[PDB]
Amino acid sequence: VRLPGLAAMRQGTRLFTPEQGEDLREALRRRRGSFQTTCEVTSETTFAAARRLREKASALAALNFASAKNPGGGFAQAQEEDLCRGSGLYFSLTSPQAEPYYAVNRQSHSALYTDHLIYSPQVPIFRDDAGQLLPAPVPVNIITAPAPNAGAVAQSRPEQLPQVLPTLRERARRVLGVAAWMEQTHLVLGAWGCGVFRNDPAGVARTFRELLEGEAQGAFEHVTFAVLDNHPQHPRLGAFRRELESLC
Ligand SMILES: Nc1ncnc2c1ncn2[C@@H]1O[C@H](COP(=O)(O)OP(=O)(O)OC[C@H]2O[C@H](O)[C@H](O)[C@@H]2O)[C@@H](O)[C@H]1O
């Protein structure tokens, strides 16, 4: 039997294409300065922060650190695979209206990828980090978008090194734009493509702070930076807790 709410979520899945770039930013324009946005930086999985936030969240979204070319990356410690294994996310990403995101990114043949985004509405979270069933599934809206593959650019197309940060910046700005366009209140963010994609975590953390301070100030009610870091150094979390203490 097909698990609860997968149908309604897959049927509602929706693609934002790069030609919606200005539709997304006028949605940020229109929503800027609506709340006193409270923001944290934590050590939880993105789904653990989602399930915690749920009961006081009118509209909850979370960022999938996605593969540009294969849904769920093709599966093996990554965050996108954590969400697929414990939610209906995969049934949404393989949905027909989502195909152009993968199709175009592969034809792109560029490690900075395109600006397509996939919006997955009311994705059921079925399991906690331990992997046991929840009593009841917890819905979370998911924004899927690929951070530029910095590691690949450095080994494959170093001429696009200068475009890495600008790509991540305009794409981050569209991720906020999709969440305001869908009028979300509570965002679960994190160390976006600072793992397998090898971006600088100080840089991703700073880009988020620039946006949350600039074009997206006030635009959301709560932003939680759910960075998981098991390495004894904790380099990712340290960079996000260090660079976003200004904002909290
Ligand atoms: N479940 C998790 N929850 C919250 N944060 C996490 C989690 N797992 C890792 N992090 C933290 O977030 C950081 C980045 O996690 P990454 O999964 O590497 O995303 P990317 O931007 O580097 O590239 C995504 C590729 O990886 C896959 O193959 C995709 O299919 C893509 O191909 C990690 O270092 C953790 O600190």
Residue numbers in the entry: 29 to 103, 107 to 279
What did the paper state?
Despite the abundance of PARP1, most of the PAR generated by DNA damage is rapidly degraded, with a half-life of less than 1 min by poly (ADP-ribose) glycohydrolase (PARG). Our study demonstrates that DrPARG is involved in catalyzing the breakdown of endogenous PAR and DNA repair in D. radiodurans. From observing the structural peculiarities of DrPARG, we show that although previously thought to be an obligate exo-glycohydrolase, bacterial PARG could exert both exo- and endo-glycohydrolase functions.
To clarify the effect of Thr267 on enzyme activity of DrPARG, we generated mutants of DrPARG by substituting Thr267 for arginine or lysine. Furthermore, we determined crystal structures of DrPARG T267R and T267K in complex with ADP-ribose for understanding the detailed interactions. In consistent to the secondary structure analyzed by CD spectrum, the substitution of the residue did not cause dramatic alterations to overall structure compared with the wild-type enzyme with root mean square deviation to wild type of 0.50 and 0.43 Å for T267R and T267K, respectively. As compared with the ADP-ribose bound TcPARG structure, the side-chain position of Arg267 was fixed like that of TcPARG by regaining complex hydrogen bonding with ADP-ribose and neighboring His262 and Cys225 as well as ionic interaction with Asp260, which suggested that the endo-glycohydrolase activity was impaired. Compared with the solvent-accessible 2′-OH with n + 1 linkage point observed in wild-type, which were inaccessible and less accessible to solvent in the complex structures of T267R and T267K, respectively. PARG cleavage assay in vitro showed T267R and T267K mutants with decreased hydrolysis PAR activity as compared with the wild-type enzyme. Consistent with in vitro cleavage assay, the mutants designed for blocking endo-glycohydrolase activity showed significantly decreased turnover rate Kcat as compared with the wild-type DrPARG, so the mutants may have reduced activity toward PAR. Short-chain PAR was not detected in the filtrates of the two DrPARG mutants T267R and T267K, as well as the TcPARG, although the mutants still hydrolyzed PAR. Since T267R and T267K DrPARG catalyze the hydrolysis of PAR without generating short-chain PAR but oligo ADP-ribose, the establishment of endo-glycohydrolase activity was not solely accounted from the lack of steric hinderance near 2′-OH.
